[PDB]
Amino acid sequence: NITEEFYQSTCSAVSKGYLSALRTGWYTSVITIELSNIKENKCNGTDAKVKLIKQELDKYKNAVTELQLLMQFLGFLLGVGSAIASGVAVSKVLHLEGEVNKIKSALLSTNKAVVSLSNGVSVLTSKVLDLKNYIDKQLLPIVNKQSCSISNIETVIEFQQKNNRLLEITREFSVNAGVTTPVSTYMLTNSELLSLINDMPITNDQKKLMSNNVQIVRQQSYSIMSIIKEEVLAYVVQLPLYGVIDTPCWKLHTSPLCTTNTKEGSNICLTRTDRGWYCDNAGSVSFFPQAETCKVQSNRVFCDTMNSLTLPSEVNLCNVDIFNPKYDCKIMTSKTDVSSSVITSLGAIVSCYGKTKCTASNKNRGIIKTFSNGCDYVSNKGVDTVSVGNTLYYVNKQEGKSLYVKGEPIINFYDPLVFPSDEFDASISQVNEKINQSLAFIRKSD
Amino acid sequence: TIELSNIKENKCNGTDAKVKLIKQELDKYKNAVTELQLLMQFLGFLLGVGSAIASGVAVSKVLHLEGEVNKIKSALLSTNKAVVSLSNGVSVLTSKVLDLKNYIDKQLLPIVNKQSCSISNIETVIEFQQKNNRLLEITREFSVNAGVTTPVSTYMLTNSELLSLINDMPITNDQKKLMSNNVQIVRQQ
Amino acid sequence: DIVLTQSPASLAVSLGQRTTISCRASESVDSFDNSFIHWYQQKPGQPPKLLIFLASSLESGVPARFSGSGSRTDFTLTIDPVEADDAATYYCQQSNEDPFTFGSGTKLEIKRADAAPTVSIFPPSSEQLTSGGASVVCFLNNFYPKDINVKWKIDGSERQNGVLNSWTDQDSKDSTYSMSSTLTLTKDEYERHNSYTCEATHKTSTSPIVKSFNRN
Amino acid sequence: VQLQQSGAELVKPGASVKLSCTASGFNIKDTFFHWVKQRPEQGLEWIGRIDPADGHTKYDPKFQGKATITADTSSNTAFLQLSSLTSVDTAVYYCATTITAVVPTPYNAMDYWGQGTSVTVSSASTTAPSVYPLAPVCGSSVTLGCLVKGYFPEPVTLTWNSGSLSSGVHTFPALLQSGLYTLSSSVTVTSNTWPSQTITCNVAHPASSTKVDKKIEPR
Ligand SMILES: [Zn+2]
Ligand SMILES: [Zn+2]
Ligand SMILES: [Zn+2]
């Protein structure tokens, strides 16, 4: 499964076992709730049974009215999308004349139908709740039969269950301005969402993937309010569809790499800034700089190409030889020699500088390693916690073998006299350019 | 730990409103169990990268092993608090905060099989949905968060349960008094 | 474990009367509102058949001649009216606590009018005599009550060594018993004597029923 | 619906045996299974129960190590493995479930039972039966007999006229004498039926793979 390599030379680590599930595009469905506009109830009197049904009908009638009022490091390199552009684009089409009537007619006999909208796009539609028929054909008839003092108390409770979902939906949208993420259990129950996946135009491998991770799918989905014309409430559900699946993926962890002299100043530091998730797709490598935004379950990675850059395969060369000519690896430089630790998939990188106390501890044995100054690594095999200064990090206990690639720290090849100490997004070649400009200009004057 | 009974498929024919609620509730419960089974399967840049739940997950991983539950299950059969040593050697305290099994298997379902699914007293169905309610919210919170919740809600750990957990934590009275007077912050962390 | 004591261990009941069986529990077998006691009927050669579940619920397809009662530690099965088919053993069982436990059983016998046996005697088969063995079989069919005495006489003197007796269980239709008595000898010893006699002593007569044959 | 259990078993002392109980008419994933032991002239002993949906089992501790209950939903079959057998394990073993109930509980009554599997623990080898017809000595009705002597182990099956002659039949329980089993059966018909009509004793002994038919013939 998962493995890990720590490169001592550039103070970074690569975890390799993972598999992709990249969100590549969107699927939009139209969800409808058929609900009825009720005429004024003539049930006077405060008989205890009566007050409950009148109160419940009133909660429903207000909820409809409430709904009517409501309808009226390198992250900076990424670029700016519009998360709900697709679903909103579908939502606006539903406003056109007799589009609801088409949807309404399509779901008249079943609860699922494919409708060709006026713009030509065919979308799945679902009737997930039928309060129109329940109220008009079961509840109100029982009220007239029993003259509003219901003999059988269970029918009012049967209504209260049906009505709660419409009340929770109207409560959520009252607070979200009609666009929510993740999509709630009231908007789409778990069984409904699983059912939409079976009917989506994707391979069984994709259907099986989504069905086994509905909670991830749910979190990557949007719920867009659309209309309440006629007797219908309609909102668009925007689902992620994963167009790239099961390609190899790897995560890069990076930490500052500094010289190890104890004197307070005069230390110089260097950090790889390309930390994040890498997944090769379609002959290229997709890079996700904010690895927090990617969600991992088992050994499969769900990222979103909205948060990616599309890079040449040669990026991989930065891990093995940072100075290679084929790709200019991104680095940052400073004189701030602060101690910290980065917990990786299968261990921990410890950048220990200055006078910091740095230790690795076992749950049973106590402290079992004290670090020297510099960037080092420890496997999660014998180690349970790592303590850097006053910070105690627990280590990941995911199983897998890690291997330490010894090497001379890269920072030793720079002398502090010509080293450019404020560069936030420089490269291997860019630092050399500033060194040669600085090494010639100072030398030439003498 | 919450004690659950797995309800097998009920054979209730009939459209009497009483049956409709009982069957509606039993299926509602069965969905939650099925849902939970799906779940088992300026200077900020200088800070450094932790793994917030690496400790909790490490405990959670051990519980997946064959019959680790039986260790837990037998330890709490006679009390609601016990310390269990897991397979990896870790001794962790375990708490039984709710026993829904005994109500369902020995009070509800017996009355169902006895009265041929036609419940006489509507109070038992309202009793059921109230008994059932907390487990339904617990499963909702987990269903929307991919199984990891923060802050810890009152459905996950009631106020008295947490205050009791603090007493049994390996900490000084200064720590217990600190946590006990700021449960709402404790929940947030 | 919960111990269930059933009494009586056996009883005789006439057709059409009502009867009761008791089942007493060691500890209470109640949870909440329910008693987890069950009653099963078992006839020889078959698995048990469930009659009553929980305390008083009659299992579907079971005649409404069976009823159950009781609350905590004391339970009752009643059969009314008793029919000839009801001759069998009855067991109670609790499921309120693990392990599930069964009672030690109550055997119900149907009481009927006395009947003398129909006696048939059979000389050894020609194949068995070829095989070098010789068994004499005596059938005593459709009698009541079960208590009966059989004696084998060879040439007018009693012989007990080698007699093998097997009774059937009470017939579910006519409430009679049957039994098989086989006297097994060696072939050489069989054809050295002439008179083989089978004597059944039964309460249906003071003089025993005698069936015999002479080795032709 | 039907629960069909495997056939009778002869087991060497110290060896093991695995019994099966295959369900027809319903899917075992939807209920609970129990195994119950009944020794001859003994009571019923609950061995344990299983939920076939997830493998969860609960045993009477008396049987722990001795009894292992498993299930396979693929073949809709429940199993009982008995290990390291001694003579006190000679007994009839039953399968059971709740089906005649609105909601199946593991605490519900056992309303359906398999027919039982008869396990005999013995070192003795298998012995085929001798089948002997019993004609009357050389009234209005006549009684004929059939003697099945000296077989091992149980069971044997005996019918009359291939089962079409069932009324007036008495078949007696087998007994051990000198290490082997002996059983007999009588049939009573009107004296006008025999010897006019042929009457044949049918005896099958599966363990020795024998099946013979013996016509009753007058002496
Ligand atoms: Zn930590
Ligand atoms: Zn409790
Ligand atoms: Zn075996």
Q: Among all ligands shown, which has an atom nearest to the Cα of D18?
A: 3
* Residue whose entry in the numeric block shows the structure tokens 């950048």: A351
Write the burial class of residue B172 (CB in 10 Å: 0-12 exposed, 13-18 middle, 19+ buried). Answer: exposed
> What residues make up the domain containing C7?
1-112
> Is B74 within 8 Å of chain D by CB?
no
Helix or strand run (H / E) with residue C99: none
DSSP secondary structure letters along chain B: -EE--PPPPP------HHHHHHHHHHHHHHHHHHHHHHHH--GGGGS-B--TTHHHHHHHHHTTSTTHHHHHHHHTSS-SEEEEE-TTS-EEEEE--EEHHHHIIIIIHHHHHHTTT--S-HHHHHHHHHHHHHHHHHHHHHHHTTT--SSPPTTTS-HHHHHHHHHTSS--HHHHHHHHT-HHHHHH-
Q: Are residues C203 and C137 located together in one domain of the fold?
A: yes
The answer to whether the CB of B160 falls within 8 A of the CB of B29 is no
Q: In this structure, what token pair is assigned to residue A17?
A: 């076992």
**Nearest-CA distance from B109 to chain D in Å?**
7
Give ∠ CA A213-A218-A219 in degrees, rounded to 5. 105
DSSP A205: H
Q: Which of A219, A342, A395 comes nearest B146 by C-beta?
A: A219
Q: Among all ligands shown, which has an atom nearest to the Cα of A387?
A: 1
Q: Are residues C43 and C100 located together in one domain of the fold?
A: yes
**Nearest-CA distance from A396 to chain B in Å?**
5
Chains within contact range of chain C (3+ C-beta pairs < 8 Å): B, D
Q: Among all ligands shown, which has an atom nearest to the Cα of B80?
A: 2
Where is the domain boundary, C112, C127, C154? C112
CA atoms within 13 A on the CB side of A104: 16
* Amino acid found at A109: S
Where is the domain boundary, D123, D145, D169? D123
Contacts of D63 (CB under 8 A, 6+ apart): D45, D47, D48
Q: Do A215 and B38 touch (CB under 8 A)?
A: yes
Where is the domain boundary, C84, C112, C140? C112
**Nearest-CA distance from C15 to chain D in Å?**
23
Q: Are residues D79 and D140 located together in one domain of the fold?
A: no
> Is C128 within 8 Å of chain D by CB?
yes
Residue C31: its chain B contacts at CB < 8 A?
A: 102, 106-107, 110
The answer to whether the CB of D24 falls within 8 A of the CB of D1 is yes
Q: Which residue from A188, D172, D113 is spatially nearest to C139, judged by alpha carbons?
A: D172
Q: Do D109 and C131 touch (CB under 8 A)?
A: no
* Residue whose entry in the numeric block shows the structure tokens 């009231």: A186
> Is D180 within 8 Å of chain C by CB?
no
**Nearest-CA distance from A224 to chain B in Å?**
18
| Cα(D68)–Cα(D48) distance, integer angstroms | 9
> Is D83 within 8 Å of chain C by CB?
no
Residue B105: its chain D contacts at CB < 8 A?
A: 105-107
Residues closing a segment before a gap in chain D (C–N exceeding 2.5 Å):
138
Q: Are residues C180 and C82 located together in one domain of the fold?
A: no
- How far does the centroid of ligand 2 lie from the alpha carbon of residue B26, in Å? 22
Where is the domain boundary, C61, C81, C112? C112
The answer to whether the CB of A164 falls within 8 A of the CB of A63 is no
Q: Are residues D20 and D79 located together in one domain of the fold?
A: yes
**Nearest-CA distance from D38 to chain C in Å?**
10
Q: Are residues C124 and C168 located together in one domain of the fold?
A: yes
Residue C54: its chain B contacts at CB < 8 A?
A: 110, 113-114
Q: Are residues C60 and C19 located together in one domain of the fold?
A: yes
Contacts of B52 (CB under 8 A, 6+ apart): none
Q: Are residues C9 and C103 located together in one domain of the fold?
A: yes
CATH number at residue D136: 2.60.40.10
Q: Which stretches of A317-376 are DSSP H helices?
A: 317-320
> Is A253 within 8 Å of chain B by CB?
yes
**Nearest-CA distance from D100 to chain C in Å?**
7
Contacts of C79 (CB under 8 A, 6+ apart): C13, C18, C19, C65, C66, C86, C108
Q: Do D43 and C49 touch (CB under 8 A)?
A: no
Q: In this structure, what token pair is assigned to residue A62?
A: 């207000």
Residue B67: its chain D contacts at CB < 8 A?
A: none
* Residue whose entry in the numeric block shows the structure tokens 């309800």: B7
Q: Are residues D83 and D161 located together in one domain of the fold?
A: no
Write the burial class of residue A12 (CB in 10 Å: 0-12 exposed, 13-18 middle, 19+ buried). Answer: buried
Strand-pairing partners, residue A32, are: A127, A234
* Amino acid found at D211: K
Q: Do A297 and B146 touch (CB under 8 A)?
A: yes
User: Any long-range contacts for A224-228 (C-beta under 8 Å, 24+ apart)?
Assistant: A224/A84, A224/A87, A224/A88, A224/A91, A224/A178, A224/A179, A225/A70, A225/A71, A225/A91, A225/A173, A225/A178, A225/A179, A226/A30, A226/A91, A226/A94, A226/A95, A227/A71, A227/A94, A227/A95, A227/A100, A228/A64, A228/A67, A228/A68, A228/A71
A120: left (phi over 0), alpha (psi -120 to 50) or beta: left
Residue D189: its chain C contacts at CB < 8 A?
A: none
Q: Are residues D43 and D129 located together in one domain of the fold?
A: no
Across chain D, how many H-helices and E-strands are there?
A: 0, 19
Number of domains within chain C: 2
**Nearest-CA distance from B69 to chain A in Å?**
20
The answer to whether the CB of D155 falls within 8 A of the CB of D118 is yes
Question: Which 3-32 residues of chain C touch chain D by CB within 8 A?
Answer: none
* Residue whose entry in the numeric block shows the structure tokens 């409808």: A32
Residue B57: its chain A contacts at CB < 8 A?
A: 396-397
- For chain D, what is the largest distance between any 2 Cα atoms, rounded to a whole number of angstroms? 67
- In the β-sheet with A366-370, what is the strand arrangement from edge to edge? A366-370, A358-362, A385-388, A391-394
Query: Is the preceding omega at residue C145 within 30 degrees of 0, hence cis?
Result: yes
> Is D30 within 8 Å of chain B by CB?
yes
Q: Among all ligands shown, which has an atom nearest to the Cα of D17?
A: 3
**Nearest-CA distance from B49 to chain A in Å?**
5
Q: Are residues C152 and C90 located together in one domain of the fold?
A: no
The answer to whether the CB of D47 falls within 8 A of the CB of D67 is yes
Contacts of D174 (CB under 8 A, 6+ apart): C166, D154, D155, D156, D181, D182, D183
Q: In this structure, what token pair is assigned to residue A198?
A: 């079976």
Helix axes A154-176, B122-144, angle to 10 degrees: 20
Chains within contact range of chain D (3+ C-beta pairs < 8 Å): B, C
CA gyration radius for chain B? Answer: 20
Q: Do B11 and D101 touch (CB under 8 A)?
A: yes
- How far does the centroid of ligand 3 lie from the alpha carbon of residue D16, in Å? 5
* Residue whose entry in the numeric block shows the structure tokens 């602060």: A338
Q: How far apart are the first and last CA of chain C?
A: 64
| Cα(C120)–Cα(C210) distance, integer angstroms | 10
Q: Are residues D131 and D88 located together in one domain of the fold?
A: no
Helix axes B173-180, B159-167, angle to 10 degrees: 170
Cβ density class A398-435: b for 16+ within 10 Å, e for less: bebebebeeeebbbeebeeeebbeebeebebeebeeee
* Amino acid found at A386: V
- How far does the centroid of ligand 3 lie from the alpha carbon of residue D3, in Å? 22
DSSP secondary structure letters along A393-422: EEPP----EEEEE----GGGGS-TTT----
Q: Do B106 and C54 touch (CB under 8 A)?
A: no
Q: In this structure, what token pair is assigned to residue C181?
A: 């008595």
User: Any long-range contacts for C211-215 (C-beta under 8 Å, 24+ apart)?
Assistant: C211/C119, C211/C120, C211/C121, C211/C138, C212/C121, C212/C153, C213/C121, C213/C123, C213/D137, C215/C123, C215/C190, C215/C191
| Cα(A345)–Cα(A446) distance, integer angstroms | 52
> What residues make up the domain containing D66?
1-123
| Cα(A96)–Cα(A107) distance, integer angstroms | 18
| Cα(A63)–Cα(A55) distance, integer angstroms | 12
Q: Are residues C140 and C45 located together in one domain of the fold?
A: no
| Cα(D36)–Cα(B4) distance, integer angstroms | 26
The number of beta carbons lying within 10 Å of the beta carbon of residue C149 is 10
> Is C91 within 8 Å of chain D by CB?
yes
Q: Are residues C135 and C158 located together in one domain of the fold?
A: yes
β-pair type (D180-190, D141-151): antiparallel
Q: Are residues D211 and D119 located together in one domain of the fold?
A: no
Write the burial class of residue D149 (CB in 10 Å: 0-12 exposed, 13-18 middle, 19+ buried). Answer: buried
Q: Are residues C135 and C80 located together in one domain of the fold?
A: no
Residue D29 φ then ψ, to 5°: -60, -20
Q: Measuring CA to CA, how many Å separate A415 from each of A258, A266, A267?
A: 12, 11, 10
Q: Are residues C71 and C95 located together in one domain of the fold?
A: yes
Residue D173: its chain C contacts at CB < 8 A?
A: 166-168
The number of beta carbons lying within 10 Å of the beta carbon of residue D199 is 22
Contacts of D112 (CB under 8 A, 6+ apart): D1, D3, D96, D97, D98, D99, D100
| Cα(C82)–Cα(A247) distance, integer angstroms | 76
Across chain A, how many H-helices and E-strands are there?
A: 11, 25
Q: Among all ligands shown, which has an atom nearest to the Cα of B95?
A: 2
Residue C213: its chain D contacts at CB < 8 A?
A: 137
Q: In this structure, what token pair is assigned to residue B95?
A: 């708490």
Q: Do B10 and D102 touch (CB under 8 A)?
A: yes
* Residue whose entry in the numeric block shows the structure tokens 């099925």: B34
The number of beta carbons lying within 10 Å of the beta carbon of residue B182 is 12
Q: Do C34 and B102 touch (CB under 8 A)?
A: no
Task: For an interface test with C, give the residue of D102, D113, D148, D183 to mutate (most C CBs within 10 A).
Answer: D113
CATH number at residue C200: 2.60.40.10
Q: Which of D51, D53, D108 comes nearest B113 by C-beta?
A: D108
Counted across chains C and D, CB pairs separated by less than 8 A come out at 138
Question: Which 148-187 residues of chain B touch chain A by CB within 8 A?
Answer: none
Q: Among all ligands shown, which has an atom nearest to the Cα of A385?
A: 1
Where is the domain boundary, D75, D91, D123? D123
Q: Are residues C106 and C4 located together in one domain of the fold?
A: yes
**Nearest-CA distance from B152 to chain D in Å?**
30
Number of domains within chain D: 2
> Is D61 within 8 Å of chain B by CB?
no
Q: Are residues D72 and D172 located together in one domain of the fold?
A: no
| Cα(A338)–Cα(B10) distance, integer angstroms | 64
CA atoms within 13 A on the CB side of B4: 19
Chains A and D touch (3+ CB pairs under 8 A): no
> Is B63 within 8 Å of chain D by CB?
no
Residue A143 φ then ψ, to 5°: -70, -45
